[PDB]
Amino acid sequence: TSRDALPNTEASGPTHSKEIPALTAVETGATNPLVPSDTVQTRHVVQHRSRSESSIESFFARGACVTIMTVDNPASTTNKDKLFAVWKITYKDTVQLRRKLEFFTYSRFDMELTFVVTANFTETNNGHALNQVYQIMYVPPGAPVPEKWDDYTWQTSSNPSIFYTYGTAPARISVPYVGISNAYSHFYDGFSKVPLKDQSAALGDSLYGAASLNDFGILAVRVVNDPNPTKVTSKIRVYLKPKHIRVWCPRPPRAVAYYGPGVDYKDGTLTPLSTKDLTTY
Amino acid sequence: TSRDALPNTEASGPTHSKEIPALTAVETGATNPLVPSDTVQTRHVVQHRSRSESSIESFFARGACVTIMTVDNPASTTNKDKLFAVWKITYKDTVQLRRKLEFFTYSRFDMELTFVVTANFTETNNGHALNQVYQIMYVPPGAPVPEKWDDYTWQTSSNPSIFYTYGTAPARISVPYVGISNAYSHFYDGFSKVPLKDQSAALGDSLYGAASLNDFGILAVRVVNDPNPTKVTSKIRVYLKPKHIRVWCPRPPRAVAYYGPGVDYKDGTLTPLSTKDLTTY
Amino acid sequence: IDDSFTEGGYISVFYQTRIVVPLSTPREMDILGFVSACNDFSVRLLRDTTHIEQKALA
Amino acid sequence: GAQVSSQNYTTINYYRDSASNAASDRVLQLTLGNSTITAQEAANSVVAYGRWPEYLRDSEANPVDQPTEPEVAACRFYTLDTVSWTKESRGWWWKLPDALRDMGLFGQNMYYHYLGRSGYTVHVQCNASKFHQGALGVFAVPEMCLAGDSNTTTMHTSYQNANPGEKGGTFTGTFTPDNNQTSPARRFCPVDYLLGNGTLLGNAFVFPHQIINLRTNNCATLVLPYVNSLSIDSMVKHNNWGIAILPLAPLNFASESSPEIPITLTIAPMCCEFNGLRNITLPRLQ
Amino acid sequence: GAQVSSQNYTTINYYRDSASNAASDRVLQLTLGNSTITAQEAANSVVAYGRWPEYLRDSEANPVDQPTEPEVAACRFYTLDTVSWTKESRGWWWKLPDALRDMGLFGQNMYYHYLGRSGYTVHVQCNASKFHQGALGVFAVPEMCLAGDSNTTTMHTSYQNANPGEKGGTFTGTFTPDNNQTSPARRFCPVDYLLGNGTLLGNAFVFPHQIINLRTNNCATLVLPYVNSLSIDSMVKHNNWGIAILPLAPLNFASESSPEIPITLTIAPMCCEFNGLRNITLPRLQ
Amino acid sequence: VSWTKESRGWWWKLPDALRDMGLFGQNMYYHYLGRSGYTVHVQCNASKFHQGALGVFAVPEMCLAGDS
Numbered sequence A, B: 001t002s003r004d005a006l007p008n009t010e011a012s013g014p015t016h017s018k019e020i021p022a023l024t025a026v027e028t029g030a031t032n033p034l035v036p037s038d039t040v041q042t043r044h045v046v047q048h049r050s051r052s053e054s055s056i057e058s059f060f061a062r063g064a065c066v067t068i069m070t071v072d073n074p075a076s077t078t079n080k081d082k083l084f085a086v087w088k089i090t091y092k093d094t095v096q097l098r099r100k101l102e103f104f105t106y107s108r109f110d111m112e113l114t115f116v117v118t119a120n121f122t123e124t125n126n127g128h129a130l131n132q133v134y135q136i137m138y139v140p141p142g143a144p145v146p147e148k149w150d151d152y153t154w155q156t157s158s159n160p161s162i163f164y165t166y167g168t169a170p171a172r173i174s175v176p177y178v179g180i181s182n183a184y185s186h187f188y189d190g191f192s193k194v195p196l197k198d199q200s201a202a203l204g205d206s207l208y209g210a211a212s213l214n215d216f217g218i219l220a221v222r223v224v225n226d227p228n229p230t231k232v233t234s235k236i237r238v239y240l241k242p243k244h245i246r247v248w249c250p251r252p253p254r255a256v257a258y259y260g261p262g263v264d265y266k267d268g269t270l271t272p273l274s275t276k277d278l279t280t281y
Numbered sequence C: 001i002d003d004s005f006t007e008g009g010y011i012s013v014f015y016q017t018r019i020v021v022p023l024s025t026p027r028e029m030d031i032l033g034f035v036s037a038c039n040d041f042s043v044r045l046l047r048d049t050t051h052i053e054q055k056a057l058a
Numbered sequence D, E: 001g002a003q004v005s006s007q008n009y010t011t012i013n014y015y016r017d018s019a020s021n022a023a024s025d026r027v028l029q030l031t032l033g034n035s036t037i038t039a040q041e042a043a044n045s046v047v048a049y050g051r052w053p054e055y056l057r058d059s060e061a062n063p064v065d066q067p068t069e070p071e072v073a074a075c076r077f078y079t080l081d082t083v084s085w086t087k088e089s090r091g092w093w094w095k096l097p098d099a100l101r102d103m104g105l106f107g108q109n110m111y112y113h114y115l116g117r118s119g120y121t122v123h124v125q126c127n128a129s130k131f132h133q134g135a136l137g138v139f140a141v142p143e144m145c146l147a148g149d150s151n152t153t154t155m156h157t158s159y160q161n162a163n164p165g166e167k168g169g170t171f172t173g174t175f176t177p178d179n180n181q182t183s184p185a186r187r188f189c190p191v192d193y194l195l196g197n198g199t200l201l202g203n204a205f206v207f208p209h210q211i212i213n214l215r216t217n218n219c220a221t222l223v224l225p226y227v228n229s230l231s232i233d234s235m236v237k238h239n240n241w242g243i244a245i246l247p248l249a250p251l252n253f254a255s256e257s258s259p260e261i262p263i264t265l266t267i268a269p270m271c272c273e274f275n276g277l278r279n280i281t282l283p284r285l286q
Numbered sequence F: 001v002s003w004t005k006e007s008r009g010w011w012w013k014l015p016d017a018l019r020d021m022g023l024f025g026q027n028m029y030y031h032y033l034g035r036s037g038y039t040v041h042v043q044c045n046a047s048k049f050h051q052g053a054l055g056v057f058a059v060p061e062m063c064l065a066g067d068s
């Protein structure tokens, strides 16, 4: 197991032999597996440290913010339309979890989502409001998307929903692995269409690196109460925790600022390293 | 069980025989049970997919909104009567669950009802109100119906009731199968009276497709608090989940907009299909 | 849904030979088509349909 | 007392009510009573839902008095009227047991008792020549409810217009709303491509059915068991089955512009029984 | 039903879904089909991830029809063009299976079917004298995505510019954004020290790789299995591997100011198979 | 082909007639030696009021005479 201790150090004395473990060849493509006992005299040490905290499960066992959505309940004495929020599910709106995940090419994991809701008043008027309730609805691809805050789509005969009362514990749910491949693709080197000579130029065009492998629907959030005389503005923060995670094909981590949802970089951000003299400690 | 995997595909080579499985006759009324191995050469595939999510239990395992009721607590400085809500129990006020259920002719199921309550102020006045409590009473057929918000009928010596405090978790109850037949009838092709030659024309008249098989009582909802100086308006959404469900005699689903509680359709809504050329992909 | 990455393919019907009839027979006819699934067919991720809607309650 | 299952996990029931718990073929001969039918071009026969008609068992009987079983006196083939199929036809419909309300002793037993139940055998006959073309779809629908002709009221069809008898009704290609507020007609307006009830015709093959293709067969046979949410019911108030016949491909003959052929229906009750004898019912059918 | 573990402590699963649960070496000879390769100065060979190419097993096969396995007709060594290494070179890249799209019967099978999969053997050849110095790094990257040349749009590289074929592309030392809004170029702008995708070159040794050092060896060999998130896929839409060659130490010879030596690539498909036969694809490659 | 009252007959050579048929033609033109058998299916339908007869023959080494 990951909590198993690391190997002990062994005592070694002076040596005089033809075999040379120090010299090697890196052109082969391998790494020399030397231990301290091959170059200096060492003593016997009983090892106690372990690598339990660097496992893949431990490296991802935190909740990371993936988005902040905004809703409001407007004043009754205005003409503004009530605002409801729509968000397309993705982990690429933020940088920390994105950088942690893109250490690898493929991954499988179950997900755990937590919702933290906060609210505030917008006008100095002493007007009041009663406790609010929020509806969070998951709309998979191909399902009807709401257009008004109170149209029929919110009946949720088949779409799962959460009803959350303000001031209680933050909401939480769990999701399984729901991909149509055998693993999630962090990178995709291809297109979705192949242009054809007979067809027109515009009929074969598509974006580079975009595929329907990464279409998971949207989350729609509304305030279920009817408007009060005073406006109330609310923000919902979404936190994502991956669990039971497996990864494949490690990659170097990002070194420059992210620019969009691809591997593109922006001019003026391509100097990640600082100055240091060659013979200075 | 429904989670059992589907049959494996079998390898098949070239064939040369008199038997013709492809040609058939649909005039008999049956469906040809062909597999891909009967028309093309196939390889061996170990199957992993299952039909666990399309079972009857899974297809109905969501809470669907069936009605929205409205109550209010008026101002103490007015003459308006306090408003209490009455609703006749039925799943035909909405369209999503109705369409899902009317895939079949008969069904049995236990029910689970959830109540979500929201409230708001109606006037800009800074006036306040203390937390409200709601009484939800089930009145079966033949029992006395309330006429005022505070008459004797609300003593509930025999009618079950729920008392709900605002701001807590949404209310919930469960009900068994409570029909007087051996199953629920989604459709009824008949009348409740037979007209007689001796009797007058009006004494035998009745509505088509209406029977007392579908009389389940009403739900009455009131605010138990006494009116404050300011008005408070509340809405209650009712969500119905059927469980332990069994169905009989499948039917084609609705293709045009619903019009009333029957199978009637309205002029100007009878064109469900769009245009498409015969030889166009 | 309509998607380029999971498109299914194409289906068509052609004359191998022509249709031949004798005299005193109709020269135009009809064909009918039906579609169904096999025993290895499955679905998942229940959702809502766009084939029914509403504007007013009850 | 806990239940252990696999996903393992543990569940416990807290309440005393389970509701609270979280979830050759071409040839055919039929003989009933003193009546027989023969057929030489058949497409086999269909038994609806794979269930044969049967009598009511003791472990499912609601009424307590001794039932009546006429048998051969009423379980026999009755021939209804014959309709004419032309190039302008849209289809025909019938209700069961409404179409046999004036058929020998079956109608007498139907109108003398208060409860009754029965299955059916339906035989549709239509023959032509080897130079005719066309196809008919015959469907048996349980609880065949049709839409009315009014856009100001719903479920307002009168008892007389919904029970035509052995003559039946016909489908139409267009919906015509009735606008006479003073003297409403109160009758069905069934549209063919909507099957008369707001559902597409192409899906009607979910119901028990057969197809008569003029180049293959000339008859169809459907065996219908008793279907209802009750063990026994009133035959004069409620119709159990509906028979619908629709042209799937229009009729055509050589080069004539007005071909026509007859279609005949024969229906036989099966395993019929009755309860609740009293004076006879005299309905207002006009 | 409770689970006891050590830290002892007890855990119970409440839900039916598991998601709810809380968590010698110098000498080499290769023979494929009718082609052979010999090498006398090698640094051994690399098998990517320790996995040899193999055919698709029954317990992992998505499509149901019989696959095609050309074998010797397509599993053979193809030699691409030869590039010239000078003192101004920054590196070259290729995509697989894009570079073999016009190679004998392999390309025909690729363009006639809808699904395909294959592994590869890559052999890079570069020889010089005992008075030359330099070093090359050869890297195999799965899902080698490169950055575009536009700072107003992202992921706007055209299908033609991303698939150059057997000629491949080159890295550059500077990033030059394209400013033609009327006629955008829609092509990659890969920078060498960022590996063309925003990550430092020094870490590229996480990928399978080898080094050709002119004083040690003159060839490199990489064996690549099939890698993807699917069992089989479309070879004309998606590239599985990318080959990148970069000068780790610049080329130098005696005192000449313009030395140059050729570099050649030979690639062999392995265990390739195809599914979904139809009419041939005719892409727009210009 | 179209059969009328003035027709005299038709001929084909194998493997010459499949030289542009999918991957068979590609394999045929990429290699130096090849061998194969065949299944030939001739289709011709009419009505019960037509009359006629066709002879279909398979000849090994079907050599034809010139026009000189």
Ligand SMILES: CCO/N=C/c1ccc(OCC[C@@H](C)CCN2CCN(c3ccncc3)C2=O)cc1
Residues within 6 Å of the ligand: A089, A090, A091, A092, A111, A136, A137, A138, A160, A161, A162, A173, A175, A178, A184, A185, A186, A187, A214, A216
């Ligand atoms: C009402 C509350 O119910 N919510 C239910 C629910 C169900 C499914 C949901 O979808 C989850 C999809 C995620 C597991 C996808 C995460 N990943 C996987 C890889 N990926 C990605 C995105 C863009 N480019 C590459 C990879 C992602 O965004 C969300 C919410």
Ligand SMILES: CCO/N=C/c1ccc(OCC[C@@H](C)CCN2CCN(c3ccncc3)C2=O)cc1
Residues within 6 Å of the ligand: B089, B090, B091, B092, B111, B136, B137, B138, B160, B161, B162, B173, B175, B178, B184, B185, B186, B187, B214, B216
């Ligand atoms: C105070 C809270 O206590 N509530 C108790 C309670 C008890 C019984 C209740 O009645 C439940 C009746 C439903 C199971 C009926 C649902 N169905 C069955 C079929 N059906 C229907 C209606 C109209 N046309 C056809 C079918 C329906 O509306 C409701 C609430």
Ligand SMILES: N[C@@H](CCC(=O)N[C@@H](CS)C(=O)NCC(=O)O)C(=O)O
Residues within 6 Å of the ligand: A149, A150, A151, A152, A153, A154, A155, B065, B237, C054, C055, C056, C057
């Ligand atoms: N727009 C309606 C109110 C919205 C409404 O009643 N919507 C019904 C039918 S469209 C519904 O299904 N609402 C879903 C919900 O809000 O829960 C009004 O004028 O008051």
Ligand SMILES: N[C@@H](CCC(=O)N[C@@H](CS)C(=O)NCC(=O)O)C(=O)O
Residues within 6 Å of the ligand: B149, B150, B151, B152, B153, B154, B155
């Ligand atoms: N109308 C009475 C108040 C209503 C009242 O006291 N009702 C009694 C007897 S009619 C009752 O049973 N109330 C039922 C309840 O509200 O819980 C008044 O003038 O204050």
